[PDB]
Amino acid sequence: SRSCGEVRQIYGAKGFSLSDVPQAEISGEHLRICPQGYTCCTSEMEENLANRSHAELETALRDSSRVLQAMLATQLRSFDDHFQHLLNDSERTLQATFPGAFGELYTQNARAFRDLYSELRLYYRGANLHLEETLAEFWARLLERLFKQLHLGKQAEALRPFGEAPRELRLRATRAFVAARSFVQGLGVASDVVRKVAQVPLGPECSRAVMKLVYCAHCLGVPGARPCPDYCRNVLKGCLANQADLDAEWRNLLDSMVLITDKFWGTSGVESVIGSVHTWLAEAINALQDNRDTLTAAPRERPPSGTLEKLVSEAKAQLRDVQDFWISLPGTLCSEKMADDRCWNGMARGRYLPEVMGDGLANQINNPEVEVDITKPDMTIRQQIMQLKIMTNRLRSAYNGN
Ligand SMILES: *[C@@H]1O[C@H](CO)[C@@H](O)[C@H](O)[C@H]1NC(C)=O
Ligand SMILES: [Ca+2]
Ligand SMILES: [Ca+2]
């Protein structure tokens, strides 16, 4: 009713000077952002409120992004730590139980096994290695020394003195270790992408659009009004479009990542080789000492649910939950922090007629609330899309045994 007392309240409680707000409505000819009409807002008040709304949206965005980063980091640490512990507990179990069973056979060769575990370790960490060739070399030297303590051209390979254990170990390790490494690496790349995209600032366009969205209701004399859901969604879809462009490759990455988890195990019944290597080694040694005089001429059931299995289930739940993130941002921010027949449509309290825009940069060309340039995409987002592409390629090749 042309008394600005309510607006004076809100402006003052937001920590701005009460000096600048008039007692009655004045001509809004001076308004740059808000639709020109009789208003309680001074230009001062207008730019201040715009700045504030901008800051608020930024804070929201960074909050969401930080939540996502937190989740991804947690998953990363979890899987890395568990893989490494599995390898490690395998080695320590080997060191503990081997001298008893195999005696001097292991006792004299221990450096070979230690070195092998070191090789597997370096491989998981992403060093360049041919695991096939490494294992082959290992079996060659080990066979040499073992044959020497049992009592050049070697007939031995193709006479399979160690049995099927070397083959099993080769296949299983080759699959599982590249699976694990690729998965962890994928988590890392996801985290980095989110962290880098969070840094991309909002433009002046988005600023004026958000100001018109939020506090222009107050300026035009209807401060009790809160934005219509479709209005807010259009404004945010216009602001976040470049971020929305990440959707495709984000989804591809996450899909390939929930795909690669299946390769942590071979086909059914046997526990993952990643923690069970020592076991196949023992199998091989036993098979050799079984073949000792002809040459002179333990892989336990998989538990119904194991640690790695539970971690994988939880992780797949998380990834399935966050796959829609980039396009889910506007609805999420609008639902939680930004917003009953009559609501603020931006010219008055009423209905918002305009149809909601589609996702992505290109779809914002006709966006009524915000003016967006679709010709030049944000190239940071583009960089990150490239990263997603590359990591996805790595994971797809890893899934194919490549
Ligand atoms: C397991 O093995 C390596 C070798 O010392 C070590 O760096 C790592 O910290 C150990 N602990 C775990 C669970 O990573
Ligand atoms: Ca979701
Ligand atoms: Ca336009």
User: By what technique were these coordinates determined?
Assistant: X-ray
Q: 3-class DSSP state for residue 344?
A: strand
The span from the CA of 140 to the CA of 144, in Å, is 6
* Residues framing ligand 1 (Cβ under 6 A): 81, 84-85, 88
Q: Cβ atoms within 10 A of the Cβ of 381, count?
A: 21
Q: Is 251 left (phi over 0), alpha (psi -120 to 50) or beta?
A: alpha
Ligand 3 centroid to Cα of residue 366, in Å, is 5
Contact 42, 311 (CB under 8 A): no
Query: Is there a contact between 383 and 193 (Cβ–Cβ < 8 Å)?
Result: no
CA-based nearest residue to 386, from 212, 204, 245: 245
- Hey, what's the torsion of the CAs at 184, 185, 186, 189, to 10 degrees? 130
CA–CA distance from 18 to each of 14, 40, 98, 259 (Å)?
10, 12, 81, 59
CB atoms within 10 A of CB 124: 20
The CA distance from 184 to 144, in Å, is: 37
Is residue 166 within 8 A of residue 172, CB to CB? The reply is no
Instruction: Note the ligand closest to the C-alpha atom of 91.
Output: 1
User: Per DSSP, what are the bridge partners of residue 270?
Assistant: 301
Report the alpha-carbon distance of residue 66 to residue 311 in Å, rounded: 22
DSSP letters of 363-400? Answer: GGTT-SSS----SS--HHHHHHHHHHHHHHHHHHHHHT
Alpha-carbon span 291 to 149, nearest angstrom: 14
d(CA 89, CA 332): 43
Biggest CA–CA distance in the chain, Å, is 109
223, 336 contact by CB (below 8 A)? no
Nearest C-alpha neighbor of 288 from the set 394, 162, 146, 169 = 162
- Say how many Å lie between the CA of residue 67 and the centre of ligand 2: 13
Closest CA to 108 of 54, 145, 155, 69: 145
The DSSP code for 205 is H
- CA 379, CA 383: separation in Å to the nearest integer? 6
Judged by its nearest atom, the ligand closest to the C-alpha of residue 275 is 1
Q: ∠2-8-11 over CA atoms, to 5°?
A: 135
User: For the CA atoms of the chain, what is the radius of gyration?
Assistant: 32
How far is residue 32's CA from residue 35's CA, in Å, rounded to a whole number? 8
- Angle (CA) 248-197-314 rounded to 5° is 65
Angle between helices 131-150 and 165-197 (to 10 degrees): 150
What is the 84 CA–ligand 1 centroid distance (Å)? 6
* Chain breaks after residues in the chain, where C lies over 2.5 Å from next N: 151, 297, 339
What residue ranges do the domains of the chain occupy? 1-402
Q: Which helix (H) or strand (E) holds 8?
A: helix 5-13
Helix (H, G, I), strand (E, B) or coil at 343: strand
- CA 385 to ligand 3 centroid distance, Å: 25
Resolution (A): 2.5
Residue nearest to atom 1 of ligand 1 (CA): 88
The answer to whether 6 touches 44, Cβ cutoff 8 Å, is: no
DSSP-derived secondary structure for 301-325: BPPSS-HHHHHHHHHHHHHHHHTTH
Could you tell me which residues come within 8 angstroms of residue 20 by beta carbon, excluding any fewer than 6 positions away? 11, 42, 44, 45
| Sign of torsion over alpha carbons 30, 35, 36, 39 | negative
Cα 359 to averaged position of ligand 3 atoms, centre (Å): 15
Question: Which of the 8 DSSP states describes residue 349?
Answer: E
Token pair belonging to 359: 């996702």
Six-digit token pair at 365? 């060309």
Provide DSSP, 145-201. Answer: HHHHHH------TTS-TTTTHHHHHHHHHHHHHHHHHHHHHHHHHHHHHHHHHTTPP
Which residue, judged by its Cα, is nearest atom 7 of ligand 1?
A: 84
User: Which of 76, 83, 86, 88 has most ligand 1 atoms within 8 Å of its beta carbon, as the pocket-test mutant?
Assistant: 88
Residue 329, CB-side half-sphere exposure with 13 Å CA sphere: 31
State how far the alpha carbon of 224 is from the alpha carbons of 10, 17, 36, 214, 401, in Å. 10, 21, 19, 11, 61
Residue nearest to atom 9 of ligand 1 (CA): 84
Query: Could you tell me the two tokens for 194?
Result: 């989110």
Q: Report the nearest atom of ligand 1 relative to the CA of 80.
A: 14
Separation between Cα atoms, residue 89 and residue 95, nearest integer Å: 10
Q: How many CB atoms lie within 10 A of CB 276?
A: 22
Tokens 């990591």 — which residue?
391
State the Cα–Cα distance between residues 279 and 298, nearest whole angstrom: 6
Q: What is the DSSP letter of 264?
A: G
Please tell me the distance from the alpha carbon of residue 236 to that of residue 309, in angstroms, as a whole number. Answer: 39
The SS3 assignment for 270 reads strand
**CA gap 74, 163 in Å, rounded:** 41
Residue by residue, DSSP assigns 107-130 as: HHHHHHHHHHHHHHHHHHTT----
Vertex 176, ends 175 and 178: CA angle to 5°?
75
